[PDB]
Amino acid sequence: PGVLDRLYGHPATCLAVFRELPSLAKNWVMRMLFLKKEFSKAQEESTGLLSGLRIWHTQLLNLRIALLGGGKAWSDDTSQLGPDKHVLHFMVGSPSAAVSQDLAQLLSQAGLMKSTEPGEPPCITSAGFQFLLLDTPAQLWYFMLQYLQTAQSRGMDLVEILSFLFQLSFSTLGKDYSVEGMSDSLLNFLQHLREFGLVFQRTDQIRLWELERDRLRFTEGVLYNQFLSQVDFELLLAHARELGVLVFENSAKRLMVVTPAGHSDVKRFWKRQK
Amino acid sequence: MVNVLKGVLIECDPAMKQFLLYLDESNALGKKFIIQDIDDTHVFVIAELVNVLQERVGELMD
């Protein structure tokens, strides 16, 4: 038995050491998971703690029954911890952790209903700026939150959950963009929403890659420069386009050169100062 | 030497097609407006608005 604390301790040490900057923790946290855990964990640094927090509920899947209840007891502590903590990485961690607690079915629907965390997932879900990576964990959280409710008879949360409706504008966007990944996430939300509350609610192709190539054909949108007063001002203005990488052409015997539209302004500024 | 600037579009066509555009420029109705000048054999200073037409016409033409 004595061995147990020592062995697992070493991995606790490793996670502690490279805790701060990246995402080292995930693999190590899993190992740590198996071997008042939550109470003790709380003191430790947040990141990684959350990682351990995330995976442990997952890992549960007799004594097991005891474990779940024990976890249920300090679901609040993690919840208090989850908020307050609230990068994309962190954000991913907070919802992933929340999602995980949700599938466990330990979380109290009430309490969850009125909490900042639920607002935060739809907030990121609404904003166009969020990246695909944040999106998938946000989406998963929502799905899991709804999954958690297997009733809705008594679940205030399945009200706030309605916040999915807000998402449609976001789905319109996303659709406008060719962001398939985002759209798929939306559909999962919808499908899951319906699922919970459904009861309550009422060769040949060779010419096709050629036809694609017919839609691409070149020219560039461009400023030409002429009637340059002496050769030094062509060569300065030319070298200062070439380092900007927006020379389309040059001919020093013409004293004439061409810049594409995106560096017209850096040239207009250099022409004014020097 | 920053004497003069002219927004234009620079076409970097091949030594085969370029003369075709020139031909497009002349012997055409409502045209001859198209090419500002031939900077190189490969490149021409042309159009702007005309570019859509030049490309399309080339497409339609053999």
Add this chain to the structure above:
Amino acid sequence: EDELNLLVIVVDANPIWWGKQTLSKCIDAVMVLGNSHLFMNRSNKLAVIASHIQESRFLYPKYELLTSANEVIVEEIKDLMTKSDIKGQHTETLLAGSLAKALCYIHRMNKEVKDNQEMKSRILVIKAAEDSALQYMNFMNVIFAAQKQNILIDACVLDSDSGLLQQACDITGGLYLKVPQMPSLLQYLLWVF
């Protein structure tokens, strides 16, 4: 689920567990594994036996029973902990005795089942200990009985070298795994067999 399945788990009690440092965790993991096994099918049953240094003893004898199983196991093991046969006071364990008990139970369950249809059974040994020459005849007797019965004997060696058990799996057509990383015990039980 059509076929009734009895999985007998023999747990080697030897104080080698001290080297393990822990028994408590081992039990928790085994319990999780059992619960899963029982949950998979209605027809699954489990029997648990302890092979201790001095003798073999029955810890327990369906999934509905699991709560009962958990209590019975925790209590039974604690009783076992006694000082005699302490540490490597006795290197070996009475596997032969445990296997004999297991085959008796399987036989009895089988007869009842015989009234009905066929039963499938397999024996799993969690082995901490070492084998000994004196042990050879007794252990082999049980092993061969199992092979004839066509009852596979799987073994998970957390530590130590029980060659006889390795041989037992080969003859029996069972599976033998020497576990690197004993803490991964749960994975081995689920995954390995």
